[PDB]
């Protein structure tokens, strides 16, 4: 729309204008972060106005007596000098910038950041029930400050900070249908236990049910006593060392029995939501602006080939269909050999035509 966001410095001498707060990360290029900064040349006194775009990873440290204290690790930093224009090294003006400059007058100066591809999106890690502080995760932020030089102590009264979000939306073209199959032969079996699971679609929306078609062909002499089907969120997190995490966001344990020399076929419906997953500390949620409720983190879309090992948080989802089989011959039947398959799927928001904020707040 034609609306813009403005935020002023504590002293009121500096203010920043942005036409958006969520910037869409298409797989090839991101939306430019173009804005307008309004200065007071009679107050600067030969100073300069610097606007900085920072992608930072916020993390906590558990080896501390103080609780609720977090750090920041910068992943990407960009700088532009605004009040004194660069010697013809200035980006072309977008239409919103033209309107903002003509509206604000002569003391309004533009800034534009080009976020490089393969950078992490805004992901917020869910704080625990007992956690008083700033939530961990990756977020972007635009900061403008008056300073004589870049390497200087920034005063709080002369700077203004604005949190922005990098987001992705569901691809328009659906992918191939997710299909997984497996064949298991036990120790003293000599016969195969076949499991075939599939999803109805490759791309799902938040709050939308997922249908899992499970076809079991038991040609062995062991009994499948329980079928476990779950939706798992995978978080590839690279902060100081590469780490991978797994979290089930939706579960369905079915007491469905498959007899020896029998065939089974059922469809199971699951829907991941946040109301039953709020206790899971560290769960990946979509980027927040201040503290508002966000859905589960959308699937991170990476480049077509390779371009892996991102230093942020990579989110993906899988459906695991597990068959538990009553083992016999060497154990006391307490344990059970598990035959499982995994189905990867995409969980994202559809491409919108307006601002994501639902504007609902007490």
């Amino acid at each position: 729309g034609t609306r813009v966001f403005k935020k002023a410095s504590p002293n009121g001498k500096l203010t920043v204008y942005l036409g958006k707060r969520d910037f869409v990360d298409h797989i090839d290029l991101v939306d430019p972060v173009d804005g307008v900064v309004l200065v007071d040349p009679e107050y600067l006194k030969e100073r300069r106005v610097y606007v900085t775009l920072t992608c930072a990873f916020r993390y906590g440290r558990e080896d501390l007596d103080v609780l609720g204290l977090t750090f920041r690790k910068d992943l990407f930093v960009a700088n532009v000098q605004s009040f004194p224009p660069a010697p013809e090294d200035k980006k072309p003006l977008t239409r919103l910038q033209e309107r903002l400059i003509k509206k604000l007058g002569e003391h309004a100066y533009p800034f534009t950041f080009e976020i490089p591809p393969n950078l992490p999106c805004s992901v917020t890690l869910q704080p625990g029930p007992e956690d008083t502080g700033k939530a961990c995760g990756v977020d972007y932020e635009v900061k403008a400050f008056c300073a004589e030089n870049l390497e200087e102590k920034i005063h709080k009264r002369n700077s203004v900070r604005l949190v922005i979000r990098k987001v992705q939306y569901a691809p328009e073209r659906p992918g191939p249908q997710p299909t997984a199959e497996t064949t298991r032969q036990f120790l003293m079996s000599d016969k195969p236990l076949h499991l075939e699971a599939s999803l109805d679609k490759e791309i799902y929306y938040h709050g939308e049910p997922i249908s899992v078609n499970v076809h079991v062909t038991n040609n062995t002499n062991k009994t499948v006593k329980k079928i476990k089907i779950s939706v798992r969120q995978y978080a590839d997190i690279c902060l100081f060392n590469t780490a991978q995490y797994k979290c089930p966001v939706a579960m369905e344990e079915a007491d469905d029995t498959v007899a020896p020399s029998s065939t089974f076929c059922k469809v199971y419906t699951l829907t991941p939501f946040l109301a039953n997953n709020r206790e899971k500390r560290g769960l990946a949620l979509d980027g927040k602006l201040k503290h508002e409720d966000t859905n589960l983190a959308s699937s991170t879309l990476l480049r077509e080939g390779a371009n892996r090992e991102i230093l942020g948080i990579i989110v993906s989802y899988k459906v695991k269909v597990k068959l538990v089989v009553s083992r016999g011959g060497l154990l006391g039947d307490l344990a059970s050999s598990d035959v499982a398959v995994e189905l990867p799927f995409t969980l994202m928001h559809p491409k919108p035509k307006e601002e994501p904020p639902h504007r609902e707040v007490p």
Partner: antibody
Amino acid sequence: EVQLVESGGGLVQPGGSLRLSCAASGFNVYSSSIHWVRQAPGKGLEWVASISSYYGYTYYADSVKGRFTISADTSKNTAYLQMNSLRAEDTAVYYCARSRQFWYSGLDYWGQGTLVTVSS
Amino acid sequence: ASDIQMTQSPSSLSASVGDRVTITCRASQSVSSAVAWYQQKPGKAPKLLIYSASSLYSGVPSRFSGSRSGTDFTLTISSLQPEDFATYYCQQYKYVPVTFGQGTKVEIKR
């Protein structure tokens, strides 16, 4: 065909109780929010209660905060409005309305409305 | 925001076919653009016309248009058809006590 069907309205005494049902069809309770709006005879629209069912939150108007209770049946895809301690001022036509859970809060689908009468 | 009040200035309006009908809604506090308009015929459920104070809902004829200026909102009907004689409500959905206006009834004139 997206639609909402309401039921459970009728005659009550000033102090009785009612339960309203909104049989949702064509959408899920996790991608949609269910709201109850009543219209007193000759008056305008007044929001009563809402349920998100994705964030597990329920909201009520300040006039029905304690007496009214909204709940949803996810498996049956049906929302409920249990109204207790009904008063004569609660006489209205109660509509159950739907809104997108994500990135929308206007009411795009409405039920036909069930008239609730409360008198001695 | 304690409780937003939506005040529709025209409580009742009479207009002929083809006339331009303008209904305005005033909010006691800034609710941004989170404003919707609804049409209600007698005995029928309200039908959503516009949302976000400017966006037209799917299936609504192009005659209906919404616009925001400040804390006030306006719904305009261009070339008022005989199907457009009903009661219209402005609603804000910026705070969980979502509030409607008192309604604007559009009548015929002769």
